[PDB]
Amino acid sequence: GKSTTLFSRHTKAIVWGMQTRAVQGMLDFDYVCSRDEPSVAAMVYPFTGDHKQKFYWGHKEILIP
Amino acid sequence: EKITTSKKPNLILNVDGLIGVAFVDMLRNCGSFTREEADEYIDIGALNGIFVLGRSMGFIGHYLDQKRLKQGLYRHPWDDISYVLPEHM
């Protein structure tokens, strides 16, 4: 079954790839739309191990694996 | 120190000052050193060695931390350098 409500205010994603600029823009969008959590939970890049990237939730800094 | 803190409020003995004076105090003021043995260890530089063997712990701690947080290469971006090369040599 194909859904009819694709996105929501609780939609969580995994972005595939090293796209710090675009995921920075997406977390910027999650902040400016007054959301509670980031839309991005994790990133998947096969050429690098598991670490944490720092991001801006407004002024505060968070870590995304 | 009592004289200098009247000049400015900050002006306190550093820990890099206090270990120097307290270690010369230890050397030439406890036993076991004459004043040509205690002053020879100061003229040679055995007070460099205290700071070096201390700061090796913090350096290896920084090394293990930078490996464990798994950070890649640092590059020092070009808006911190301000190249000042001559005109045409």
Swiss-Prot record, chain A:
Phenotype when changing residue 54 to R/Q: Decreased acetylation and increased de novo lipid synthesis. Abolished ubiquitination by the BCR(KLHL25)complex
Ranges that cross the membrane: none
Residue positions, PTM N6-acetyllysine: 54, 60
Sequence position, cross-link Glycyl lysine isopeptide (Lys-Gly) (interchain with G-Cter in ubiquitin): 54, 60
Post-translational modification: Phosphorylated by PKA and GSK3 in a sequential manner; phosphorylation results in activation of its activity. ISGylated.
Subcellular location(s) per record: Cytoplasm, Cytosol
Assembly and oligomerization: Homotetramer.
Functional summary from the UniProt entry: Catalyzes the cleavage of citrate into oxaloacetate and acetyl-CoA, the latter serving as common substrate in multiple biochemical reactions in protein, carbohydrate and lipid metabolism.
Entry similarity comment: In the N-terminal section; belongs to the succinate/malate CoA ligase beta subunit family. In the C-terminal section; belongs to the succinate/malate CoA ligase alpha subunit family.
The protein's name in its UniProt record: ATP-citrate synthase
The species this protein was found in: Homo sapiens
Gene (UniProt): ACLY
